[PDB]
UniProtKB/Swiss-Prot annotation:
Protein source organism: Mus musculus (Mouse)
Region Interaction with LAYN, annotated ranges: 255-378
Parent-protein start and end of this portion: 1 to 403 of 2541
SUBUNIT field: Part of a complex composed of THSD1, PTK2/FAK1, TLN1 and VCL. Interacts with THSD1; this promotes interaction with PTK2/FAK1 and VCL. Interacts with NRAP and LAYN. Interacts with SYNM. Interacts with ITGB1; the interaction is prevented by competitive binding of ITGB1BP1. Binds with high affinity to VCL and with low affinity to integrins. Interacts with APBB1IP; this inhibits VCL binding. Interacts with PTK2/FAK1. Interacts with PIP5K1C. Interacts with F-actin. Interacts with SVEP1.
Name the UniProt record assigns to this protein: Talin-1
UniProt function note: High molecular weight cytoskeletal protein concentrated at regions of cell-matrix and cell-cell contacts. Involved in connections of major cytoskeletal structures to the plasma membrane. With KANK1 co-organize the assembly of cortical microtubule stabilizing complexes (CMSCs) positioned to control microtubule-actin crosstalk at focal adhesions (FAs) rims.
Domain FERM: residue ranges: 96-378
Entry remark concerning the domains of this protein: Consists of an N-terminal FERM domain linked via a short unstructured region to a large flexible C-terminal rod which contains 13 amphipathic helical bundles (R1-R13). The rod begins with a five-helix bundle (R1) followed by three four-helix bundles (R2-R4). These are followed by a series of eight five-helix bundles (R5-R7 and R9-R13) in which the N- and C-termini are positioned at opposite ends of the bundle, creating a linear chain. The four-helix bundle R8 does not disrupt the chain because it is inserted into a loop in the R7 five-helix bundle.
Length: 378
């Protein structure tokens, strides 16, 4: 039957659960307390808060949905964050390991500031491995379209948790690839890259070309065509043709192209493979499958939309013919939403070009990125 000298009204103090690893303690804060001073008071009450230099720790407001967890800023008052009695704050190390697959295919773990955006993290990575031009590179997930990361947002809010390894990826440069039979190791790297892009469909090609490529691929993998062993049914066509072309009728066309190679060496076939790829107007282009509205028709028409350093291009989805091309110079503005992408060509044409796609923000950022480059050369 006593009074409690510790009691303060629920309205004048914030009662928060402070979590450090598996330790939790409830402490009382004046609600205008700055985050950095709250960290001090935490160090005075919880021994596990002393597990490192004091400025290495901060406060993190977790959530049942990990995408909604946020780091608190040191200069903000606690009541800025709309906290209520009983809420939980983690006292957390500000840097955390981020696993990144290097350009040599190995994984390196790099400490990054966990409150920052993907761009900031990329900059920390490039700093650690001696890359000055971080704008030549980006981070992508390794899932599977779903691997794209918006570098102006955080990993956390895009659903990337701390366990996930990301890939460091060099962007495409036409100046990167200059073919020659003198350097077999570099020739093979170029061949593998061009072949993989065709087989996985990121370089879209016609059916006839896909079988031509497969003909060189056969020369490379099997040597000269031998009608005793390279007969109907031999090929696992899924390994030689883009998925949309995996049809038995393609094998006859591949074998024709293979035979046409004669006794051509493995090196010479790799040269021809790479040369044929670079000869196509689709080479090096970043493509997106978008849905177009054609005047007259009610069903939208799937179309390949390609973005390069100097143009936007419409490509037929079945034949891969280049239907139309717009210089980046002749685009007045663009817009993206989660469901569409629209281009305004000012007085170069009547009507906007507006398509359905879930990759509109990706398209918009590519266009903006390539336009900024042209500006900086001016």
């Amino acid at each position: 039957n006593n009074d409690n000298p510790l009691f303060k009204s629920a309205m004048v103090a914030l009662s928060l659960k402070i979590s450090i690893g598996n330790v939790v303690k409830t402490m009382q804060f004046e609600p205008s307390t700055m985050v950095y001073d709250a960290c001090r008071m935490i160090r005075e009450r919880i021994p596990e808060a002393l597990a490192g230099p004091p400025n290495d720790f901060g406060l993190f407001l977790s959530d049942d949905d990990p995408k909604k967890g946020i780091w608190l800023e040191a200069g903000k008052a606690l009541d800025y964050y709309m906290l209520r009695n009983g809420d939980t704050m983690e006292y957390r190390k500000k840097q955390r390991p981020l696993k990144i697959r290097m350009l040599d295919g190995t994984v390196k773990t790099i400490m990054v500031d966990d409150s920052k955006t993907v761009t900031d993290m990329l900059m920390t990575i490039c700093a650690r491995i001696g890359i000055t031009n971080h704008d030549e590179y980006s981070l992508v997930r390794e899932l599977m379209e779903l691997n794209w990361l918006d570098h102006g947002r955080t990993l956390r809010e895009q659903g990337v948790e701390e366990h996930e390894t990301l890939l460091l990826r060099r962007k495409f440069f036409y100046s990167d690839q200059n073919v020659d039979s003198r350097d077999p190791v570099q020739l093979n790297l170029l061949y593998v890259q061009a072949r993989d892009d065709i087989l996985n469909g990121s370089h879209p090609v016609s059916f006839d070309k896909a079988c031509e490529f497969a003909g060189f691929q056969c020369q490379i993998q099997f040597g000269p065509h031998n009608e005793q062993k390279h007969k109907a049914g031999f090929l696992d066509l899924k390994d030689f043709l883009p998925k949309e072309y995996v049809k038995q009728k393609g094998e006859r066309k591949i074998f024709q192209a293979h035979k046409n190679c004669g006794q051509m060496s493995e090196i010479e076939a790799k040269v021809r493979y790479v040369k044929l790829a670079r000869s196509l107007q689709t080479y090096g282009v970043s493509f997106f499958l978008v849905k177009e509205k054609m005047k007259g028709k009610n069903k939208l028409v799937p179309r390949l939309l390609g973005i390069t350093k100097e143009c936007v291009m419409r490509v037929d989805e079945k034949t891969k013919e280049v239907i139309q091309e717009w210089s980046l110079t002749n685009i007045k503005r663009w817009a993206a939403s989660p469901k569409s992408f629209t281009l305004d060509f000012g007085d170069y044409q009547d009507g906007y070009y507006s398509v359905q796609t879930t990759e509109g923000e990706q398209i918009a950022q590519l266009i903006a990125g390539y336009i900024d480059i042209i500006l900086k050369k001016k």
